[PDB]
Amino acid sequence: DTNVKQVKVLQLINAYRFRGHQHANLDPLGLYQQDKVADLDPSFHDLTEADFQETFNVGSFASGKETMKLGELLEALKQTYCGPIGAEYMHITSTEEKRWIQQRIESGRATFNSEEKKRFLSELTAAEGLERYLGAKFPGAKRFSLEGDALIPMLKEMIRHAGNSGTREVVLGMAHRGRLNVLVNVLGKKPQDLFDEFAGKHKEHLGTGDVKYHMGFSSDFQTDGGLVHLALAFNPSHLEIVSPVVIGSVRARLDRLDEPSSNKVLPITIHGDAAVTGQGVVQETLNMSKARGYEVGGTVRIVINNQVGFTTSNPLDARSTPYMTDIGKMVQAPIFHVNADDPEAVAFVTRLALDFRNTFKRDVFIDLVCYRRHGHNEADEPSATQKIKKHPTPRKIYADKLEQEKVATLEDATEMVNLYRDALDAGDCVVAEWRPMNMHSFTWSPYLNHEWDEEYPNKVEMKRLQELAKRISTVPEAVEMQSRVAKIYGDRQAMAAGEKLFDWGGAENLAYATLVDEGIPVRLSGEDSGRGTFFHRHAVIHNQSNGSTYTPLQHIHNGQGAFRVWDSVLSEEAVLAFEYGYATAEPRTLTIWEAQFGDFANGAQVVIDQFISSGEQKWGRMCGLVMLLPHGYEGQGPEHSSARLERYLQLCAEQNMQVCVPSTPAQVYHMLRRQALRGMRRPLVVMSPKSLLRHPLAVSSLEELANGTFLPAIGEIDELDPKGVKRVVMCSGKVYYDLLEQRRKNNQHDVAIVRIEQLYPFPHKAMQEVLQQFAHVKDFVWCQEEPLNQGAWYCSQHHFREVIPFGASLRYAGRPASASPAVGHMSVHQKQQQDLVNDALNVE
């Protein structure tokens, strides 16, 4: 009769552990408050009340406590769950996690000593002093004021606590706002250079530069556990694309270690206000946060919940979700709502989150709710109600709290402000732990300032090459194959014996085997490329008799290159930024990316347009990814057909990318080793075709791989007398073979065909060396199988009209331009295909 209220308050306290966080006080100004705060939440609503003076504890379990009253229970517990911080954790089903968080945030509050309180007030006082000093000198600029002020102490506290738990390199990517404050007061960028580039006239690099709030920065940081090599990743004007970049960066920093002890490398990510729930890249990347080959045990990603949206106020249902970070209930990841009014709470919360990520290896969020004092660039209008003016600064209330706590007086905080302004006026480095950088962490020292025509050790010893073929083809008899897989491997065993010529797939993973034994690893991580998309790689043989897998490239010899294929989850726009961040933080590993189809790789456009094709000219950051893109006009579809090639050729600028179209498999051999061990890291977008995978003219002998060389522009392979030749046909892609299968079909001698295997670095030497044998002929053509807008026809005026001789002319052959690059119907497709091929060969 009296224990029914005991179990009833156990029920209500469990349901108050579920949804106690919406009764909590989170807004630093007090406009996040809803009216639905007393509805089955407290004791007083349903069946219980006060004025009892008795409530016993957990009972027979010896807690050692003096729990006397349910009013005392809720008053002690609202000071834990419902106070400055809310804890959205009870929905995780893993009971070890639940009891671990119960052991942390209920039984014991981590009370801080006096010196840590002093350093928190000092550091956030320094943060707000920095931004007011920036307003003092430079009045009007793209400043992106932080003004929430809780970010700096919790960043430095989490860096200190990661130092005490041994995390040697922790990299953070973040959005545009709060940039300069973390660059100065956390990492320790040189403030005088920052004020110089505010004042402009800066000579940082020979590239085209970028605005001052995009350049991230590496630094060395001293904690009580040792040195910490912490970096800040780059960022374009787009938001929220940087978290797959930074998870790529930490997987690159984990593979350069001997062992992926995932506590030793930490990604942080600071997200925007309405972009952790706005942008769809975070769905893919925290989805990707537990997939094998992609996970780093999660990340401590932090949401600055500004309670703004660059125009939005806070009504009831104009808010798209109830909290602005509910995404972290996709995976059963804990969320922690923390205000800015008391950074004791944010220290406690980021200690809890870092302890969580280092113990149970899953991503944690930090809901950092705070306000926005000034604007982006102009007035704080479209958020109407401004309580912000009569709301005090965080250093004022926190210093007044610690003055009431008998720690720091007005003289102390005033001396801190004046010290900090003097430190900024000096131009000295602000952070007291910044160090100079040694050369070994500067791993990109042999990979700077090259041109595409360098010499790389292309020639391979033929005996070792045949041994690589016979090791990647001979498969142990435990892992039972599939019949078509067995036919492919028997055929490439015949290719190893010199019987059959190389088709595409055998030559391509032979190129993999040529890389991985010398010591240069390869990470291919495409979508669904463990077997290839067109059934033409099969680098993972599934044992269809047992179920386990065997990779015949991970068993060549010990001391090899670390080759790991990862079939991606279906991201296509945040797997590519992952392979960017893996590619720009390790120059050794040849990181290639294979889409499922051509224009199915159109999702990552921001990653192509603003990272990989603008990285060198904006930041001076190098990247050597390879984009294996399918590209074909067989007629299988309108957008199963082709990636947009001008979307990799309207980036036509100063040897930045390099698009190249391998026709022969000898070309894909030389292109992957041209990218791998050259010395320059600039992006490939290779047009890895479809019809040439199963084609009986894949002309690739093993003679063409040992003594074969790098070829950008393969001229005529047949025998033709150039005196009678009245036409040459410059054409790239499969259409050559189509033209070839019409030229030798109708034995036409007065026209030669020249392929152009590489397009973007304007092949001058390679084209003029293969046209001195066909120079006297005037009228050239540029065939293609793409439409007239598509292809490389708007690269013609750049260099096709200088490859041409003087007394000579050019004209066009190709499909006439249509919006769909391929028509959907097969009959009209082959009709205009055959008409175009028999139009390209005209003068007979």
Ligand X SMILES: O=C([O-])CC(=O)C(=O)O
Q: Is the Cβ of residue 272 or residue 787 nearer to ligand X in the bound state?
A: 272
Give yes or no for residue 19 binding a second copy (CB under 8 A): yes
Strand intervals (E) in 444-597:
522-524, 541-542, 549-550, 590-594
Q: Which of 403, 491, 567, 716 binds a second copy (CB under 8 A)?
A: 567
Residue 164 interaction partner, one of a second copy, ligand AMP, ligand X, none, beta carbon < 5-8 Å per kind = none
Is 139 a binder of a second copy (CB under 8 A)? no
Judged by CB under 6 A, does residue 692 bind ligand AMP?
A: no
Supply the minimum distance, in Å, between the C-beta of residue 312 and a second copy: 6
329 or 564: whose CB is closer to a second copy? 329
Site track 431-470 with ligand AMP (rule: CB under 6 A), x = hit: ----------xxxx--------------------------
Give min distance, CB of 470 to a second copy, in A.
24
218 binds, among ligand X, a second copy, ligand AMP, none (CB under 5 to 8 A by kind): ligand AMP
If you ran DSSP here, which 8-state letter would residue 2 be given?
A: -
Say whether residue 310 binds a second copy (CB under 8 A): yes
Closest separation in Å from C-beta 489 to ligand X: 25
Among a second copy, ligand X, ligand AMP, none, what does residue 790 contact (CB within 5–8 Å per kind)?
a second copy
Q: Provide the minimum distance between the beta carbon of 441 and a second copy in the complex, in angstroms, as a whole number.
A: 26
Which residue type sits at 497?
A: A
Angle at Cα 698 formed by Cα 695 and Cα 704, nearest 5°?
170
Dig out the tokens for 300 from the structure.
Answer: 């401590």
Residue type, 837: V
Contact 471, 556 (CB under 8 A): yes
249 in contact with a second copy (CB under 8 A): no
d(CA 691, CA 735): 10
Binding pattern to ligand AMP, positions 314-353, x when CB under 6 A? Answer: ----------------------------------------
What residues between 599 and 628 interact with ligand AMP by CB under 6 A?
A: 621-623
- For the record, the structure tokens of 127 come out as 């943060």
| Chosen from ligand X, a second copy, ligand AMP, none, partner binding at 803 (C-beta under 5 to 8 Å by type) | none
Please give the Cα distance from 781 to 772 (Å, whole number).
Answer: 16
711 lies in the site for a second copy, by CB under 8 A:
no
Contact between residue 294 and residue 285 where contact means Cβ atoms under 8 Å apart: no
Residues 182-211 contacting a second copy, CB under 8 A = 200-202, 208-211
Q: Between 444 and 600, name the residue whose CB sits nearer to ligand AMP.
A: 444
547: helix, coil or strand? coil
Which helix or strand (DSSP H or E) is residue 811 part of?
strand 809-812
Among ligand AMP, ligand X, a second copy, none, partner that 322 touches (CB below 5 to 8 angstroms by kind) = a second copy
Count of residues in the chain: 844
Q: Are 306 and 376 within 8 A, CB to CB?
A: no
User: By C-beta, is 443 or 546 nearer to a second copy?
Assistant: 546
What is the pattern of x (binds a second copy, CB under 8 A) and - over residues 64-103? ---------------------------x-x-x--------
Q: Which of residues 581-610 bind a second copy (CB under 8 A)?
A: 596-597, 599-600, 602-603, 605-606, 609-610
Report the distance separating Cα 298 and Cα 289, nearest Å.
Answer: 5
Task: Give the one entry of a second copy, ligand X, ligand AMP, none that residue 444 binds, where binding means its C-beta sits below a cut-off of 5 to 8 angstroms depending on kind.
Answer: ligand AMP
Determine, following the binding rule CB under 6 A, whether residue 33 of this chain makes contact with ligand AMP: no
| CB-count exposure of residue 438 (10 Å: 0-12, 13-18, 19+) | exposed
Task: Tell me how far, at minimum, the Cβ of 133 lies from ligand AMP, in Å.
Answer: 28
Q: Which one of 157, 573, 579, 785 is in contact with a second copy (CB under 8 A)? A: 573
Task: Name which of a second copy, ligand AMP, ligand X, none residue 34 binds, using a CB cut-off of 5 to 8 Å depending on partner kind.
Answer: none
Site track for a second copy across 354-393, x = CB under 8 A: ------------------------xx-xx-xxx-------
- 3-state SS record for 385-413: CCCCCCCCCHHHHHHHHHHHCCCCCHHHH
Place of tokens 């709470």: 345
801 binds a second copy (CB under 8 A): no
Q: What is the dihedral of CA 269, 272, 273, 277, to 10 degrees?
A: -80
Residues in touch with ligand X (CB under 6 A): 239, 272-275, 309-310, 528, 570, 596, 600
In the 8-state DSSP scheme, what is residue 574?
S
DSSP string, 42-103: SSTTTT--S-------SSSS--------HHHHHHHHHTTTSSSEEEE-TT---HHHHHHHHH
Q: How far is the CB of 587 from ligand AMP (least distance, A)?
A: 7
Give the separation between CA 124 and CA 375, rounded to whole angstroms.
20
Tell me how far, at minimum, the Cβ of 598 lies from a second copy, in Å: 9
Q: According to the 3-state scheme, what is the secondary structure of 241-252?
A: CHHHHHHHHHHH
* CB atoms inside a 10 Å sphere around CB 132: 14
Q: Which structure tokens are listed for 672?
A: 């992957």
For residue 655, the tally of other CB atoms under 10 A from its CB is: 14
Dihedral angle computed from the Cα positions of residues 285, 286, 292 and 293, in that order, rounded to the nearest 10 degrees: 30
For CA atoms 203, 208, 210, 211, the dihedral sign is positive
Q: How far is the CB of 97 from ligand X (least distance, A)?
A: 31
CB 9 within 8 A of CB 48: yes
Residues 194-253 that bind ligand AMP (CB under 6 A): 218, 231
Residues 88-127 that bind ligand AMP (CB under 6 A): none
- Report which DSSP code applies to 542: E
How many angstroms separate the first and last alpha carbons of the chain?
106
Amino acid at 12: L
Residue from 585, 628, 759, 837 touching ligand AMP (CB under 6 A): that is: 585
Is position 257 an interface residue for ligand AMP (rule: CB under 6 A)? no
679 binds, among ligand AMP, ligand X, a second copy, none (CB under 5 to 8 A by kind): none
Please state, in angstroms and rounded to a whole number, the distance separating the CA atoms of residues 787 and 220. Answer: 53
Of residues 223 and 551, the one with the C-beta less far from ligand AMP = 223
Residues 652-691 that bind a second copy (CB under 8 A): 652-654, 656
Q: CB under 5 to 8 A by kind: which of ligand AMP, ligand X, a second copy, none does 646 bind?
A: a second copy
- The verdict on 162 binding ligand AMP (CB under 6 A) reads no
Residue 547 contacts a second copy per CB under 8 A: yes
**Residue 443 binding: pick among a second copy, ligand X, ligand AMP, none (C-beta 5-8 Å cut-off by kind):** ligand AMP
- If binding means CB under 6 A, how many residues of this protein chain bind ligand AMP? 11
Residue 55's binding partner among ligand X, a second copy, ligand AMP, none (Cβ under 5 to 8 angstroms by kind) is none
The owner of tokens 């990799």 is: 648
According to the binding rule CB under 6 A, does residue 584 interact with ligand AMP? yes
Region for 32 from its dihedrals, namely left if φ exceeds 0, alpha if ψ lies in -120 to 50, beta otherwise: alpha
Residue 809 lies near a second copy (rule: CB under 8 A): no
Residue 523 touches ligand AMP, criterion: CB under 6 A: no
Please count the residues of this chain forming the interface with a second copy, following the rule CB under 8 A: 129
Q: How far is the CB of 386 from ligand X (least distance, A)?
A: 18
Q: How far is the CB of 274 from ligand X (least distance, A)?
A: 5
3-state secondary structure of 218: strand
Question: What is the helix (H) or strand (E) element at residue 181, kind and residue range?
Answer: helix 179-182
Q: Cα–Cα distances in Å, from 207 out to 585, 586, 620?
A: 20, 22, 6
Strand ranges (E), 209-329: 218-222, 227-232, 265-271, 300-305
Provide the token pair at 637. Answer: 């579809």
- Contacting positions for ligand AMP (CB under 6 A): 218, 231, 441-444, 584-585, 621-623
